[PDB]
Amino acid sequence: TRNGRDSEAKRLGVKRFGGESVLAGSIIVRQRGTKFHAGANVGCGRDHTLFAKADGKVKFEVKGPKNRKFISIEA
């Protein structure tokens, strides 16, 4: 065969889903590009990894001019 190669899988996705209680610093979404965006009390690291900046429940929203998915946290 000419090919027969592949990389190791990266385990990317929504780790904590909407409504779930998360602790301050908990990773909510591992992904490549900002598919989801950082809302209230949610960060965005160098890897575009969205993480909780406060102890609370995760909230998925669909707002903005371009209709993007945002992840917020509400205590």
Query: Which residue in the set 18, 20, 25, 74 belongs to the binding site for RNA (CB under 7 A)?
Result: 25
Please answer whether residues 48 and 34 qualify as being in contact, where contact means their C-beta atoms are separated by less than 8 angstroms: yes
Q: Which of Mg ion, RNA, none does residue 40 bind (CB under 5 to 8 Å by kind)?
A: none
State the amino acid at position 45 in one-letter form. Answer: G
Q: Is 10 in the site for RNA (CB under 7 A)?
A: yes
Q: What is the dihedral of CA 11, 24, 19, 44, to 10 degrees?
A: -50
Cite the DSSP H helix spans in the chain. none
Point out which residues bind RNA (CB under 7 A): 1-15, 23-27, 30-35, 37, 43, 45-49, 51, 53, 64-66, 68
Point out which residues bind Mg ion (CB under 5 A): 45
